[PDB]
Amino acid sequence: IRHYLQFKDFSLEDYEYVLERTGILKRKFKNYETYHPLHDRTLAMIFEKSSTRTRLSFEAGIFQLGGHAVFMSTRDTQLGRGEPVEDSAQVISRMVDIIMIRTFEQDIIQRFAENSRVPVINGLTNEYHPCQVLADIFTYYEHRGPIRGKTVAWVGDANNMLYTWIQAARILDFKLQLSTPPGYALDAKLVDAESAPFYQVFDDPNEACKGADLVTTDVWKRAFADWCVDEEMMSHANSDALFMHCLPAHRGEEVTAGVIDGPQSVVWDEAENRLHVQKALMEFLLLGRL
Amino acid sequence: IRHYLQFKDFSLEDYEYVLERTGILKRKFKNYETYHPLHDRTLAMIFEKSSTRTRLSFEAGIFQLGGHAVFMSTRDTQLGRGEPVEDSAQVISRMVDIIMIRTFEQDIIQRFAENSRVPVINGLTNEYHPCQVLADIFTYYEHRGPIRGKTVAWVGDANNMLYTWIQAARILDFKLQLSTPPGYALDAKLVDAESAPFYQVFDDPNEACKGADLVTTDVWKRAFADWCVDEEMMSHANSDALFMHCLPAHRGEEVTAGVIDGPQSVVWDEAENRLHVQKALMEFLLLGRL
């Protein structure tokens, strides 16, 4: 059983395949071609943190592959609290073919996975958000070609997106340049020492953006003010740099309207591409390589 | 309405597309992937010259694409005799989506096509056999890579296969080297003068095979004896040359058992590939490029 819990669960080879499948399945999507490799297959969507966006992307995605997603959300309990992790994992994986969990803690999805008969996908935890970084990287390929050797700048809080980017940089061999406000820096305990050669920390976010091919941030306040991605910051990056932001976005906080609504922003395509990479993920976890 | 009556009906660009589709659809075939772009579509197979082989290849091919082939063969009449060409074309093309005709004369399939509401494919005439040369060239790609600039040797009678090869040489820009017995040479009236730069005639078939990447012949007798493709003849070609023969074959006539049953022969793969190129043909004529 393979799972998709952290970006580093897949090898370079895995990603080369999945990214190519993503483009192929997207073309089938845009060609209204009927392709149902997952006919009669069920995905359990376990949401403990709400997102319609991600419900839509997974739900429409497996439908388009011939399968069906079941939305599982409870108000008053959660895995590891008021629901026993193993009980849920053993029973649910006996009924469905694949499972997605969006929750708070990586430890919980990991423990669940350990007792699951079927593949488990991380739809977001406090620690990692591999599906979005995957979509981000696919979006880059589409607009700018392969990301290898390119420079990605991260400006903002050290949050699940950043830790995921760090893992990606190592695996896909690109350069990550990051800058955070002084008290919201990387937790050196949550960063693999093996990834040190692939990222660099800057005190000034404007320096981190110099020569960037991709500039990205996320939602976080009086302290983050110099870490707002504005148009002057963007001007430090390469002229054809892309701006990505994982949604939702708060205009006037992490980012200006000028940037996210500007000509370098690909945030909508980037959100759309969650649908396409997640379809490739599910196909790959269930069918392997063709 | 586009038709497929002669090899030269398609451009270089058309062939690059169709050959790539052929490989893609063959992979779907080998992956047991359900792909039915031709669902609810009908092919009329009009056979005035019998071939189970070609009935199988077209019939199984459209089935695998979700459609259905209707076998139409009469004992006592034929198009242009006892059946009016236009009457058949007007009525049949009102009922089906695509038509294949295997018959004697190119003039007849051409006249039929002129009055057909749907695409017409030449499944073989006395003058041309484009589906087989297409399969032959696909088979070459599979085993040896793109045919461009390569050398194809034709040894034997000047028959529909040869005239088709000549058209192919011009379009795909490879070198054709041909040799026939003195009285069974090219009919200069049936050869486009524009294709002269792409073929060369040799009095000695062994010379025609020198430096060949592909050696090929067909069924035709006391005169053809020096034009038998044997192992000494094959030894004149490049060491990794392929031997192709459009089936059926008569061992001990045009070709030896030693050659056609030998390690350079790809005649079975070549016959199989009629199925795959013809599926790409039908998809292309009905759907165009994706």
PDB file of all heavy atoms in Angstrom, chain A residues 21 28 31 33-36 290, chain B residues 21 28 31 33-36 290, unseen atoms left out:
ATOM      1  N   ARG A  21       1.220  12.368 -16.319  1.00  0.00           N
ATOM      2  CA  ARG A  21      -0.177  11.914 -16.265  1.00  0.00           C
ATOM      3  C   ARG A  21      -1.125  13.084 -16.057  1.00  0.00           C
ATOM      4  O   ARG A  21      -2.195  13.116 -16.645  1.00  0.00           O
ATOM      5  CB  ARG A  21      -0.419  10.879 -15.155  1.00  0.00           C
ATOM      6  CG  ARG A  21       0.075   9.482 -15.469  1.00  0.00           C
ATOM      7  CD  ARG A  21      -0.351   9.030 -16.859  1.00  0.00           C
ATOM      8  NE  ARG A  21      -1.722   8.526 -16.900  1.00  0.00           N
ATOM      9  CZ  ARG A  21      -2.325   8.125 -18.014  1.00  0.00           C
ATOM     10  NH1 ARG A  21      -1.680   8.181 -19.173  1.00  0.00           N
ATOM     11  NH2 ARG A  21      -3.569   7.670 -17.972  1.00  0.00           N
ATOM     12  N   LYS A  28      -7.503  15.080 -21.669  1.00  0.00           N
ATOM     13  CA  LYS A  28      -8.715  14.272 -21.786  1.00  0.00           C
ATOM     14  C   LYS A  28      -9.924  15.017 -21.220  1.00  0.00           C
ATOM     15  O   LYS A  28     -11.006  15.006 -21.808  1.00  0.00           O
ATOM     16  CB  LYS A  28      -8.538  12.932 -21.071  1.00  0.00           C
ATOM     17  CG  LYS A  28      -7.627  11.956 -21.797  1.00  0.00           C
ATOM     18  CD  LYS A  28      -7.737  10.558 -21.212  1.00  0.00           C
ATOM     19  CE  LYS A  28      -6.367   9.980 -20.899  1.00  0.00           C
ATOM     20  NZ  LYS A  28      -6.141   8.678 -21.586  1.00  0.00           N
ATOM     21  N   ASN A  31     -10.737  17.639 -23.673  1.00  0.00           N
ATOM     22  CA  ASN A  31     -11.277  17.033 -24.905  1.00  0.00           C
ATOM     23  C   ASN A  31     -12.638  16.315 -24.726  1.00  0.00           C
ATOM     24  O   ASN A  31     -13.153  15.704 -25.671  1.00  0.00           O
ATOM     25  CB  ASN A  31     -10.272  16.050 -25.532  1.00  0.00           C
ATOM     26  CG  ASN A  31      -9.132  16.742 -26.269  1.00  0.00           C
ATOM     27  OD1 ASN A  31      -9.332  17.738 -26.957  1.00  0.00           O
ATOM     28  ND2 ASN A  31      -7.929  16.189 -26.146  1.00  0.00           N
ATOM     29  N   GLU A  33     -13.216  13.633 -23.375  1.00  0.00           N
ATOM     30  CA  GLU A  33     -12.991  12.230 -23.668  1.00  0.00           C
ATOM     31  C   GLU A  33     -13.405  11.423 -22.438  1.00  0.00           C
ATOM     32  O   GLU A  33     -13.050  11.770 -21.311  1.00  0.00           O
ATOM     33  CB  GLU A  33     -11.518  12.013 -23.999  1.00  0.00           C
ATOM     34  CG  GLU A  33     -11.106  10.570 -24.192  1.00  0.00           C
ATOM     35  CD  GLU A  33      -9.624  10.432 -24.527  1.00  0.00           C
ATOM     36  OE1 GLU A  33      -9.187  10.977 -25.568  1.00  0.00           O
ATOM     37  OE2 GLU A  33      -8.900   9.777 -23.741  1.00  0.00           O
ATOM     38  N   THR A  34     -14.179  10.364 -22.641  1.00  0.00           N
ATOM     39  CA  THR A  34     -14.611   9.536 -21.519  1.00  0.00           C
ATOM     40  C   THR A  34     -13.505   8.570 -21.094  1.00  0.00           C
ATOM     41  O   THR A  34     -13.095   7.695 -21.868  1.00  0.00           O
ATOM     42  CB  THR A  34     -15.871   8.725 -21.861  1.00  0.00           C
ATOM     43  OG1 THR A  34     -16.902   9.613 -22.294  1.00  0.00           O
ATOM     44  CG2 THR A  34     -16.354   7.964 -20.636  1.00  0.00           C
ATOM     45  N   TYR A  35     -13.014   8.750 -19.873  1.00  0.00           N
ATOM     46  CA  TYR A  35     -11.972   7.899 -19.317  1.00  0.00           C
ATOM     47  C   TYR A  35     -12.320   7.567 -17.875  1.00  0.00           C
ATOM     48  O   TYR A  35     -12.321   8.444 -17.010  1.00  0.00           O
ATOM     49  CB  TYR A  35     -10.612   8.595 -19.387  1.00  0.00           C
ATOM     50  CG  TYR A  35      -9.478   7.783 -18.805  1.00  0.00           C
ATOM     51  CD1 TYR A  35      -9.212   6.498 -19.259  1.00  0.00           C
ATOM     52  CD2 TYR A  35      -8.671   8.301 -17.800  1.00  0.00           C
ATOM     53  CE1 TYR A  35      -8.177   5.752 -18.730  1.00  0.00           C
ATOM     54  CE2 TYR A  35      -7.633   7.563 -17.265  1.00  0.00           C
ATOM     55  CZ  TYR A  35      -7.390   6.290 -17.734  1.00  0.00           C
ATOM     56  OH  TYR A  35      -6.356   5.551 -17.204  1.00  0.00           O
ATOM     57  N   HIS A  36     -12.627   6.300 -17.619  1.00  0.00           N
ATOM     58  CA  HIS A  36     -13.103   5.886 -16.298  1.00  0.00           C
ATOM     59  C   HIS A  36     -12.323   4.725 -15.703  1.00  0.00           C
ATOM     60  O   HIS A  36     -12.910   3.673 -15.444  1.00  0.00           O
ATOM     61  CB  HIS A  36     -14.557   5.441 -16.379  1.00  0.00           C
ATOM     62  CG  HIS A  36     -15.509   6.528 -16.749  1.00  0.00           C
ATOM     63  ND1 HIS A  36     -15.238   7.862 -16.533  1.00  0.00           N
ATOM     64  CD2 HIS A  36     -16.735   6.479 -17.316  1.00  0.00           C
ATOM     65  CE1 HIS A  36     -16.257   8.587 -16.954  1.00  0.00           C
ATOM     66  NE2 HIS A  36     -17.178   7.773 -17.437  1.00  0.00           N
ATOM     67  N   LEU A 290       0.984   2.969 -15.931  1.00  0.00           N
ATOM     68  CA  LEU A 290       0.392   2.260 -17.041  1.00  0.00           C
ATOM     69  C   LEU A 290       1.333   1.244 -17.705  1.00  0.00           C
ATOM     70  O   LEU A 290       2.513   1.194 -17.409  1.00  0.00           O
ATOM     71  CB  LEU A 290      -0.213   3.226 -18.065  1.00  0.00           C
TER      72      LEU A 290
ATOM     73  N   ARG B  21      -0.742   8.677 -33.052  1.00  0.00           N
ATOM     74  CA  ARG B  21      -2.010   8.113 -32.569  1.00  0.00           C
ATOM     75  C   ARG B  21      -1.977   6.593 -32.593  1.00  0.00           C
ATOM     76  O   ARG B  21      -2.490   5.956 -31.686  1.00  0.00           O
ATOM     77  CB  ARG B  21      -3.220   8.593 -33.387  1.00  0.00           C
ATOM     78  CG  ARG B  21      -3.674  10.005 -33.081  1.00  0.00           C
ATOM     79  CD  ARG B  21      -3.785  10.252 -31.582  1.00  0.00           C
ATOM     80  NE  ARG B  21      -5.036   9.754 -31.013  1.00  0.00           N
ATOM     81  CZ  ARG B  21      -5.329   9.813 -29.719  1.00  0.00           C
ATOM     82  NH1 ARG B  21      -4.457  10.337 -28.865  1.00  0.00           N
ATOM     83  NH2 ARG B  21      -6.488   9.349 -29.276  1.00  0.00           N
ATOM     84  N   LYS B  28      -3.157   1.709 -25.458  1.00  0.00           N
ATOM     85  CA  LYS B  28      -4.469   1.553 -24.832  1.00  0.00           C
ATOM     86  C   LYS B  28      -5.009   0.139 -25.045  1.00  0.00           C
ATOM     87  O   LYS B  28      -5.559  -0.473 -24.129  1.00  0.00           O
ATOM     88  CB  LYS B  28      -5.453   2.584 -25.385  1.00  0.00           C
ATOM     89  CG  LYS B  28      -5.211   4.001 -24.891  1.00  0.00           C
ATOM     90  CD  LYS B  28      -6.385   4.908 -25.217  1.00  0.00           C
ATOM     91  CE  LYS B  28      -5.924   6.185 -25.900  1.00  0.00           C
ATOM     92  NZ  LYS B  28      -6.374   7.402 -25.166  1.00  0.00           N
ATOM     93  N   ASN B  31      -3.045  -2.043 -22.824  1.00  0.00           N
ATOM     94  CA  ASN B  31      -3.387  -1.774 -21.414  1.00  0.00           C
ATOM     95  C   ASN B  31      -4.843  -2.133 -21.026  1.00  0.00           C
ATOM     96  O   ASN B  31      -5.269  -1.881 -19.892  1.00  0.00           O
ATOM     97  CB  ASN B  31      -3.117  -0.304 -21.045  1.00  0.00           C
ATOM     98  CG  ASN B  31      -1.641   0.004 -20.835  1.00  0.00           C
ATOM     99  OD1 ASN B  31      -0.902  -0.786 -20.256  1.00  0.00           O
ATOM    100  ND2 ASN B  31      -1.214   1.180 -21.287  1.00  0.00           N
ATOM    101  N   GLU B  33      -7.425  -0.658 -21.740  1.00  0.00           N
ATOM    102  CA  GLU B  33      -8.075   0.582 -21.362  1.00  0.00           C
ATOM    103  C   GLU B  33      -9.296   0.764 -22.262  1.00  0.00           C
ATOM    104  O   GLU B  33      -9.212   0.585 -23.477  1.00  0.00           O
ATOM    105  CB  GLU B  33      -7.093   1.738 -21.526  1.00  0.00           C
ATOM    106  CG  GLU B  33      -7.674   3.116 -21.298  1.00  0.00           C
ATOM    107  CD  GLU B  33      -6.634   4.218 -21.472  1.00  0.00           C
ATOM    108  OE1 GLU B  33      -5.630   4.224 -20.721  1.00  0.00           O
ATOM    109  OE2 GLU B  33      -6.826   5.076 -22.365  1.00  0.00           O
ATOM    110  N   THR B  34     -10.440   1.091 -21.673  1.00  0.00           N
ATOM    111  CA  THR B  34     -11.651   1.291 -22.464  1.00  0.00           C
ATOM    112  C   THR B  34     -11.659   2.677 -23.109  1.00  0.00           C
ATOM    113  O   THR B  34     -11.678   3.701 -22.414  1.00  0.00           O
ATOM    114  CB  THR B  34     -12.920   1.135 -21.612  1.00  0.00           C
ATOM    115  OG1 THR B  34     -12.908  -0.142 -20.973  1.00  0.00           O
ATOM    116  CG2 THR B  34     -14.158   1.239 -22.490  1.00  0.00           C
ATOM    117  N   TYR B  35     -11.621   2.698 -24.437  1.00  0.00           N
ATOM    118  CA  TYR B  35     -11.644   3.939 -25.198  1.00  0.00           C
ATOM    119  C   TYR B  35     -12.587   3.778 -26.380  1.00  0.00           C
ATOM    120  O   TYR B  35     -12.316   3.004 -27.300  1.00  0.00           O
ATOM    121  CB  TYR B  35     -10.239   4.299 -25.685  1.00  0.00           C
ATOM    122  CG  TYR B  35     -10.183   5.566 -26.508  1.00  0.00           C
ATOM    123  CD1 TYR B  35     -10.674   6.765 -26.008  1.00  0.00           C
ATOM    124  CD2 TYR B  35      -9.637   5.565 -27.785  1.00  0.00           C
ATOM    125  CE1 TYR B  35     -10.625   7.926 -26.756  1.00  0.00           C
ATOM    126  CE2 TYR B  35      -9.583   6.720 -28.540  1.00  0.00           C
ATOM    127  CZ  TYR B  35     -10.078   7.898 -28.021  1.00  0.00           C
ATOM    128  OH  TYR B  35     -10.025   9.052 -28.770  1.00  0.00           O
ATOM    129  N   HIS B  36     -13.700   4.502 -26.350  1.00  0.00           N
ATOM    130  CA  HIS B  36     -14.741   4.336 -27.366  1.00  0.00           C
ATOM    131  C   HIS B  36     -15.157   5.636 -28.034  1.00  0.00           C
ATOM    132  O   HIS B  36     -16.324   6.019 -27.939  1.00  0.00           O
ATOM    133  CB  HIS B  36     -15.997   3.746 -26.739  1.00  0.00           C
ATOM    134  CG  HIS B  36     -15.824   2.361 -26.211  1.00  0.00           C
ATOM    135  ND1 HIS B  36     -14.852   1.503 -26.678  1.00  0.00           N
ATOM    136  CD2 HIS B  36     -16.504   1.682 -25.260  1.00  0.00           C
ATOM    137  CE1 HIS B  36     -14.940   0.354 -26.034  1.00  0.00           C
ATOM    138  NE2 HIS B  36     -15.932   0.437 -25.166  1.00  0.00           N
ATOM    139  N   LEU B 290      -7.089  15.561 -32.114  1.00  0.00           N
ATOM    140  CA  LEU B 290      -7.574  15.858 -30.786  1.00  0.00           C
ATOM    141  C   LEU B 290      -7.358  17.316 -30.356  1.00  0.00           C
ATOM    142  O   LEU B 290      -6.682  18.075 -31.026  1.00  0.00           O
ATOM    143  CB  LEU B 290      -7.019  14.872 -29.753  1.00  0.00           C
TER     144      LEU B 290
END
